[PDB]
């Protein structure tokens, strides 16, 4: 009775570990952009839920960076590529910038003019947790190169929920934090040496943070930080700013793709991860 349970538990653990080890590597190439829709103002965000059961593919959409509390939900990708019909939901507080994420059926965003991370339910429409990001800048203090109140950037990867911000103690450099997806508590922090005001955008792939150089023109992935080894490396992986302005750029584990907001348009990039043995 107990021996077979131990055997199946070991089997599940080994399957999970081996499939996670084969899941990702290091990025080496970014594909050409693919445009889905043209809507909204030049600044905004759009994403999908990674931990969603297959067959939902609900696209969440947000327009504006200063004063907005309306989020759009499209019931399918085909309902977002062509159909202009959506469901509008109202947030208790307006967000700042495009550094919001959707994960585990809830939206993580930043409160207006404050360093407060808020978890909001998109199904029950209620509030659970409103925590404070310890030692983080707000109100265009440590924004990206394009600005627009992007001081806090929330993302997810195969390991969980991460927040990229900057600390006055760490000059103005990029600081990575791993957050509990329930209590929004600090688990582990990595303090890098790349300034956030000269970044423009950043994303995380399964534990490695890739930081862009600029936002318009010759955009390229300039910086890489490995939190497991706590090391850094200057790369030169290039991509293409087709519409000459990038405001949001996030990595979505399930689709293994980079969702991007290109000058008021919704675009996708494809990553090329390699593993060395």
Ligand X SMILES: *[C@@H]1O[C@H](CO)[C@@H](O[C@@H]2O[C@H](CO)[C@@H](O)[C@H](O)[C@H]2NC(C)=O)[C@H](O)[C@H]1NC(C)=O
User: Which residues here bind ligand NAG, judged by CB under 6 A?
Assistant: 255, 257, 268, 270
Choose from ligand NAG, Ca ion, ligand X, none: what does 153 bind? Cβ within 5-8 Å by kind: Ca ion
Q: Closest residue (Cβ) to ligand X? A: 191
Start-to-end C-alpha separation, the chain: 39
* Cα–Cα distance measured from residue 25 to residue 28, given in angstroms and rounded to the nearest whole number: 9
Tokens read off for 124: 């029950």
Question: Least CB distance from residue 131 to Ca ion, whole Å?
Answer: 20
Residue 183: CB atoms within 10 A of its CB come to: 12
Binding mask 248-267 for Ca ion (x = CB under 5 A): --x-----------------
Name the site residues for a second copy (rule: CB under 8 A).
Answer: 4, 7-8, 10-11, 14-15, 18-19, 21-25, 28, 272-277
- Interactions with ligand X, residue window 103-122 (CB under 6 A): 104-105
Binding mask 175-204 for ligand X (x = CB under 6 A): ------x-------x-x-------------
Using the 8-state DSSP alphabet, how is residue 142 labeled? S
* Strands laid side by side in the 127-132 sheet: 101-103, 106-110, 116-121, 127-132
Question: Least CB distance from residue 80 to ligand NAG, whole Å?
Answer: 12
Question: Least CB distance from residue 69 to ligand X, whole Å?
Answer: 24
Does 153 help bind Ca ion (rule: CB under 5 A)?
A: yes
Tokens read off for 119: 């978890």
Nearest one of 156, 158, 108, 97 to 133, comparing CA atoms? 108
* Cα–Cα distance measured from residue 144 to residue 202, given in angstroms and rounded to the nearest whole number: 9
> Among residues 111 and 201, whose Cβ is nearest to Ca ion?
201
Choose from Ca ion, ligand NAG, ligand X, none: what does 257 bind? Cβ within 5-8 Å by kind: ligand NAG
Sign of the alpha-carbon torsion through 202, 208, 36, 165: negative
- Interactions with ligand X, residue window 134-173 (CB under 6 A): 169-170
């Amino acid at each position: 009775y107990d021996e077979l349970q131990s055997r199946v538990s070991n089997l599940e653990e080994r399957l999970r570990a081996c499939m996670q080890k084969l899941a990702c590597g290091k990025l080496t190439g970014i594909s050409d952009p693919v445009t889905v829709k043209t809507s909204g103002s030049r600044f905004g965000s759009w994403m999908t839920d990674p931990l969603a059961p297959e067959g939902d593919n609900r696209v969440w959409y947000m327009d504006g960076y200063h004063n907005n509390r309306f989020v759009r939900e499209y019931k399918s990708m085909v309902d977002f590529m062509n159909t202009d019909n959506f469901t509008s939901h109202r947030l208790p507080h307006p967000w700042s910038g495009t550094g919001q994420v959707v994960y585990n059926g809830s939206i993580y965003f930043n409160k207006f003019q404050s360093h407060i991370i808020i978890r909001f339910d998109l199904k029950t429409e209620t509030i659970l947790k409103t925590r404070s990001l310890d030692y983080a800048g707000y109100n265009n203090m440590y924004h990206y190169a394009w600005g627009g109140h992007s001081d806090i950037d929330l993302m997810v990867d195969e390991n969980g929920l991460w927040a990229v911000y900057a600390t006055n103690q760490n000059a103005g450099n990029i600081v990575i934090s791993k957050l509990d997806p329930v209590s929004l508590q600090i688990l582990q922090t990595w303090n890098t040496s790349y300034p956030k005001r000269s970044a423009g955008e950043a994303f995380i792939i399964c534990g490695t943070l890739y930081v862009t150089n600029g936002y318009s023109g010759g955009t390229k992935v300039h910086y890489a930080y490995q939190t497991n080894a706590s090391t850094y490396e200057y790369i030169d992986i290039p991509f293409q700013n087709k519409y000459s302005h990038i405001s949001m750029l996030d990595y979505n584990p399930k689709d293994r793709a980079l969702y991007a907001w290109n000058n008021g348009h919704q675009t996708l990039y494809n990553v090329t991860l390699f593993h060395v043995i």
